[PDB]
Ligand binder design. Sequence first.
Ligand code: CLA
Ligand code: CLA
Ligand code: CLA
Ligand code: CLA
Ligand code: CLA
Ligand SMILES: CC1=C(/C=C/C(C)=C/C=C/C(C)=C\C=C\C=C(C)\C=C\C=C(C)\C=C\C2=C(C)CCCC2(C)C)C(C)(C)CCC1
Ligand code: SF4
Lengths: 95, 153, 141, 100, 33, 42, 67, 80
Amino acid sequence: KYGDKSVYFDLEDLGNTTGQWDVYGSDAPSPYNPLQSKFFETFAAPFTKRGLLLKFLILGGGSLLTYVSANSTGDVLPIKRGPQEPPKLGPRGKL
Amino acid sequence: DISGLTPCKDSKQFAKREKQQIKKLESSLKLYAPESAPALALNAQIEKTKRRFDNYGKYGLLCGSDGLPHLIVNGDQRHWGEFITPGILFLYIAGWIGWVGRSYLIAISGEKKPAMKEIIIDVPLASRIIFRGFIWPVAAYREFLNGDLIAKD
Amino acid sequence: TPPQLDPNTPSPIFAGSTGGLLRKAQVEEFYVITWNSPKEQIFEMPTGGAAIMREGPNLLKLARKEQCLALGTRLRSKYKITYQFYRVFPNGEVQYLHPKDGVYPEKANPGREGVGLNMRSIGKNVSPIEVKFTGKQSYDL
Amino acid sequence: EVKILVDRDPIKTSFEEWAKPGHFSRTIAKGPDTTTWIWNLHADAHDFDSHTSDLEEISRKVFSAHFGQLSIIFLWLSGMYFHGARFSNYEAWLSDPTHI
Amino acid sequence: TFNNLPSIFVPLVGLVFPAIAMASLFLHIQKNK
Amino acid sequence: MRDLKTYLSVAPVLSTLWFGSLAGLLIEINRLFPDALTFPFF
Amino acid sequence: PPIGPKRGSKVKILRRESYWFKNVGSVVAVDQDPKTRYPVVVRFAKVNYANISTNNYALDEVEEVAA
Amino acid sequence: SHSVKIYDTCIGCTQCVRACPTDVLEMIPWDGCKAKQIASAPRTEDCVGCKRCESACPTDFLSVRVYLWHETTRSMGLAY
Ligand code: CLA
Ligand code: CLA
Ligand code: CLA
Ligand code: CLA
Ligand code: CLA
Ligand SMILES: CC1=C(/C=C/C(C)=C/C=C/C(C)=C\C=C\C=C(C)\C=C\C=C(C)\C=C\C2=C(C)CCCC2(C)C)C(C)(C)CCC1
Ligand code: SF4
């Protein structure tokens, strides 16, 4: 009996003694409109498969990153501009 | 003239160092009255500096291109006074100390609780033992020959 | 001896602390200690704070064995009461743990056997070269 | 009520406890088995809650220790005022307290 | 396009390959046969 | 004075007395023979 | 016959794993039971790292010193 | 988990067991000492490794002897 006066070791009800309570888990039904839910369930199902989501994210993020860096003109980031200045000589002539 | 070093009584950089330090002291001597006590202390320091440089001149110190007394510790007799005559004077005194503190430790080794004489030194026993180490080298020599210097475990 | 068969006895009066059973009880073993206190009194429980154990039987569920045995030694040395704790896995199978013979382990009860016991001095252990490329170590011959 | 509440001659002034070192405890008032004894002597030197387990003796010890600390602070102040008297330019600083 | 090759490979080794290796080695770290 | 000579026999009191005497000796030697870098007395 | 050294005999230690290895000690007592493996109780002048001056030693882990 | 092996130099003083905060050790009957008891170690799986057992063993070096080994949640002193 877990609900007795200061008894907290009901052995068959070991979820209440171990602290397996859902502090905030609500079993209340779906709050969203079912048509919006159906839209998201059909349009996000392609991303459900994990082994096909990890591969997709890898080969899509790397693709977009190696692409947007390649076709980045010399206005976004200055490393692709160049010196844009006469190169100055180093110490001792150049050495 | 060993190791490419001119002597310090002949080194121009040594005399220049002397004159520089003396001018540095005199520039601090101008701010005080000539009869005042800081001025007299500065003048005493000036004579101390002058006779210090004179003594480094006369004692055979060798001065380099930087103009500072270098010590020739190799073994040349001309410079034994730089390292060996002090060095023996160290090994004597140091060997006094260790021959005393060892002997004391042997004299309080046969007590019941000999640790309460390590922290509370028997001044009579220590004063009897202290001058035993005056002529310590013959005692250490003989104890090396008699085997009393090294414990046999 | 037969174990003591942990019942649903009451617990001490405690206002709650941040030293309880977080997840080592949900998925792994947690522990429970039972002690018979002759009177109701205050005691410093090992999870931080101060609880008031009741008269007669008490029961406190703790997260690891060191809490249980620390509290037990403080009980046996300060309040002189006889403690005995268990280990309860999250599926059940409460394991009797502390005395294991009824008498405390400092007393040489017969029946308990020699396990973890080498019949040699400590420096007669062979070197690691003797037990190299073998699953055994230098202290298991 | 708040009485005076003192007692006469609780501890005998003598150098007997100056002689035996580490007198103030059980495990230090035996002598040095090792050199850790010295460190544990100085470490537990002012640990009056470890020497005697009563607040009376502890409180007397810390009270007289505060008196020793006050004697030290007064001695240090005497030193500073004296070094300002005989070993200072305090007059010359008063005459020109911006370049002296 | 040879001054553009650093822009291809520095992200692909420094951002993409570290994500690949971190993910794969985190899966290898938590695997259970 | 009994048991004061035992306290003054203790290692720190005795060490501070010995090193105060020794330091005064060295200090007064360096006053007498300042700025020494050789032993010329032979 | 009493086995081992005597209750005041000086002895040295041949135990490799001891603090007082190749160091002399004083035999306090020898347990005459022929079932105790380490009967020779020795007393040493200087403590070990555990601040302990005595340990029981075996008969073959000990050597009666000739001094 | 750990490996608390003891050796026959034990004298049966029962201090290793009275220091043990996890009941790893327990005195058993024995015939090798004046006290006629020796300290076994059945519950080695409960050993945290704190070595209070061998900080209380009054032998020349040690009789109880903790060899640190595979660390489990009981041996890593984990309440979570
Ligand atoms: C060593 C490899 C490496 C490389 C190649 C980059 C590259 C870049 N970093 Mg840096 N970064 C790195 C390591 C690296 N980082 C580390 C180790 C740290 C921690 C100190 C940082 C911290 C850091 C900060 C704090 C910031 C950057 C920013 C940037 C961007 C440059 C800013 C700019 O002018 O573009 C401007 C370009 C944009 C604003 C557009 C971004 C385009 C994104 C990246 C494309 C998305 C690709 C893909 C879907 C996601 C990745 C997939 C994955 C598999 C890699 C550029 C993409 C800046 C930035 O852009 O923030 C996002 C910025 O604020 N980085
Ligand atoms: C009102 C001030 C005050 C008072 C009354 C005390 C009183 C006490 N403290 Mg506390 N403490 C204080 C301030 C104070 N402390 C401060 C400011 C700190 C932070 C550093 C601490 C940190 C502290 C710790 C961490 C511990 C104590 C402990 C103790 C007790 C024993 C101390 C002892 O015997 O050492 C006697 C005195 C010494 C051993 C000398 C200390 C030498 C100092 C550290 C060297 C510095 C000197 C100088 C600046 C350096 C130059 C020296 C020169 C010669 C080269 C005692 C109850 C101990 C205790 O109760 O444990 C049970 C303990 O463990 N204190
Ligand atoms: C109005 C009276 C009075 C005054 C002035 C003080 C002042 C002081 N007390 Mg307090 N004290 C008082 C009443 C008073 N007490 C009472 C009634 C009690 C009992 C409840 C205590 C119990 C008490 C304790 C337990 C301790 C103090 C301590 C201290 C000193 C703290 C250090 C400080 O601030 O240095 C500032 C320094 C000075 C002002 C220099 C002091 C110089 C004069 C001569 C002494 C002050 C007058 C004093 C009460 C003696 C009266 C005459 C005497 C012959 C009877 C300080 C001097 C602490 C201390 O330092 O220990 C010594 C301490 O441990 N007092
Ligand atoms: C000369 C007079 C005298 C004599 C013979 C005694 C004798 C005694 N006192 Mg008392 N005492 C005195 C003066 C005296 N006291 C004074 C003036 C004070 C006020 C501070 C006290 C306060 C006092 C307390 C609170 C206690 C004693 C205790 C004792 C006993 C132990 C002494 C000991 O081992 O410590 C010898 C210690 C020393 C000689 C150290 C001197 C420390 C001084 C005060 C501070 C010096 C600090 C220094 C400036 C800073 C360090 C600098 C350095 C790094 C260069 C013994 C019966 C103890 C006792 O009986 O209780 C069990 C005790 O608890 N005394
Ligand atoms: C370990 C390295 C080292 C070395 C080799 C030296 C060496 C020297 N230093 Mg330097 N110094 C050092 C570390 C060192 N110092 C450190 C660490 C510091 C900072 C604390 C200093 C700070 C320092 C200063 C500030 C000064 C020196 C000075 C000196 C010189 C000492 C002159 C003197 O007074 O002795 C003279 C000899 C003695 C004091 C010994 C006398 C011993 C007694 C009387 C017994 C001897 C007689 C005996 C009975 C045997 C007789 C034989 C028979 C009849 C029985 C000397 C060249 C001084 C100097 O002149 O500058 C060059 C100087 O002003 N040093
Ligand atoms: C001359 C010279 C030199 C050189 C030299 C050499 C090289 C040497 C070597 C040497 C050696 C190679 C040595 C060895 C030794 C060894 C040993 C082994 C020893 C021992 C000893 C002892 C043991 C002692 C002790 C003691 C004493 C007596 C005192 C104090 C105390 C005591 C006890 C510590 C030079 C060049 C620098 C410079 C010039 C001069
Ligand atoms: S502490 Fe050492 S000697 Fe004592 S019972 Fe345990 S194993 Fe034996």
